[PDB]
Amino acid sequence: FNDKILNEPLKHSDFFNVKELFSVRSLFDARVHLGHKAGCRHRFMEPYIFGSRLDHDIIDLEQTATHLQLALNFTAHMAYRKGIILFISRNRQFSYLIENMARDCGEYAHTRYFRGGMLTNARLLFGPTVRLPDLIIFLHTLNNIFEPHVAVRDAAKMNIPTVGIVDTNCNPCLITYPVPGNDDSPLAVHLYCRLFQTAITRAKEKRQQVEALYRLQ
Amino acid sequence: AGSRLETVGSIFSRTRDLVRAGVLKEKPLWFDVYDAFPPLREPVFQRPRVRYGKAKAPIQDIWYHEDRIRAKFYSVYGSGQRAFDLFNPNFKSTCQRFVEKYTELQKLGETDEEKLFVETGKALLA
Amino acid sequence: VESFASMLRHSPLTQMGPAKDKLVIGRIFHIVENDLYIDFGGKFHCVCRRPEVDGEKYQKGTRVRLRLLDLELTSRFLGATTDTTVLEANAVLLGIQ
């Protein structure tokens, strides 16, 4: 019975010590509890947006920490089965670092233009039998134009649980794991990407080890 | 390739009922992963209407106790002339040190805080 | 996980209060093609070009004083019921050290 990979590692929360990779202090030190102006604030973003500091929204640190924990746990347990994670960042704020982290890990990124269907019509531009991404981590869903990334609709149109670093200008309508947080500060995105790299790397390492030990049975 | 219409909201129940039907012969893999770690706010496809009339958004305005201290410091004396780093957490300098000293001396005053304010100002300036 | 109240209270962006006529010092977060977007915490970074008086010391990890003026920069134009953000600050530069 080599099917223990679908039971043993899933019967525990934060098995890879995901709660220790970050914390409330780690977020407070990176200025993640910030938000853009409250002018174009989204309706469904009000519960997350705790307060404001003169046209500057502030998000509760506990909610953001819990969302980060859940999203990282899900991403790790998905990579535990070669879960093809997909990054998105068209704002050009940290596309270089995001691509470098994706290279260091086994995930991929889609920080370029969305042509004639890259996920809904991936049978023509690519091969016929191509496993589509089972997870999308929107690093910067807000592109240069006043409009969120269109990949959310494509993901919803293909049954894909997506993660997103949502903010005040975002629209967490169909995101399965919204991650409220700041997107203007550089240290915030740096910490985000470092945590992602470490988490996915540890997930892949534990995957290899445990899968080998189980198949050896 | 599964039910993807965003009319309900979450895809977990969609895939579950589809597998129960008989279409999806073999499950993918994320089933147990989602079953073990469910989300906080489920993406229930709700009409994202715009706040029109009295539909207000009770969003409290954050205001700390140091607001009055900073107002007095910048009204009595000049504006912020000290170089602030603001990179590393809880950085300290001269104006930040003065604000910290004021917060330490507040409350526990009752009598008059302007006396201690002027005292600290004269000690820092002369 | 320490105290959530103290951490939310004592923070750089909240400690600086309403940025207005505050000389802030910082470094450049990313070299620009022909500009000088110097960072300094806060909510946004200033925007300007290289000055004529000493314009070489500006390096990725330096310390140059700024002024911080209007960290929002927004204005409801005509029919736009919402705001039009620019993600800038625009402040008068002082010098080096």
């Binding site: 307060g51 | 409290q60 305005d61 954050i62 205001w63 106790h65 | 109240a5 939310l8 309403p18």
Partner: peptide, 25 residues
Amino acid sequence: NEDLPISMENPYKEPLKKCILCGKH
């Protein structure tokens, strides 16, 4: 208690924004 955000009396209030006729008819 004191380290939490509590709406104060709204400081940083500018006096009466007089235009030109501050007190000279």
